[PDB]
Amino acid sequence: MEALVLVGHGSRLPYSKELLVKLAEKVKERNLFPIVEIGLMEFSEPTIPQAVKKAIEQGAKRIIVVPVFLAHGIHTTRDIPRLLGLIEDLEIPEDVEIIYREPIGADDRIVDIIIDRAFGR
């Protein structure tokens, strides 16, 4: 019924995809969602349209898209809502709802992490 698509920037280096893969596997371990897929905005596969199609093919009717980005930018305000057909300017989903969630932001947990990293933990 419900799918979680995690969507990330993607890079020419492999770290960005590897991080999405690891993060997807950790939410799988939580057993919260029937379907979990990943999608990279640029130069890596799977792409965002593929991740969404794969979620439909698995019979998700509600698709939760979470942009695994620190802050809003061009990616999260133009390109991604485009690729998801949420914005009037290569794929369509027919009859199902995409729910586009927020980025990570200045969460208190990010300041815990940063403080750990600052001490080499």
Added chain:
Amino acid sequence: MEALVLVGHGSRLPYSKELLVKLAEKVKERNLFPIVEIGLMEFSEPTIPQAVKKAIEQGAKRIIVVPVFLAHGIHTTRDIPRLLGLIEDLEIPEDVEIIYREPIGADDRIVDIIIDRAFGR
């Protein structure tokens, strides 16, 4: 003695800088570090060289640089260690050491946050 410089991507949109500013203010309220400054790699000020110089001028001898990025990429492996003179291609005085920390990675806290964001928390 010790300064924490948080360094982030920067954007043409303002969210990226605003997130670093918020994150810096949150670590300031923790009272862990004598000096805390921020630096944006591109498009915005303060820049990484300015953030580091400011920290020296405040009398930091140990400068902890934390890249506020989700994964390693070109930014964290080429451009930033460049801007920090950490890589033979900014006059850091020898009596100062820059300690370049790791990015955020696939932290368990990031999967907590993603799960929150997936439910619109």
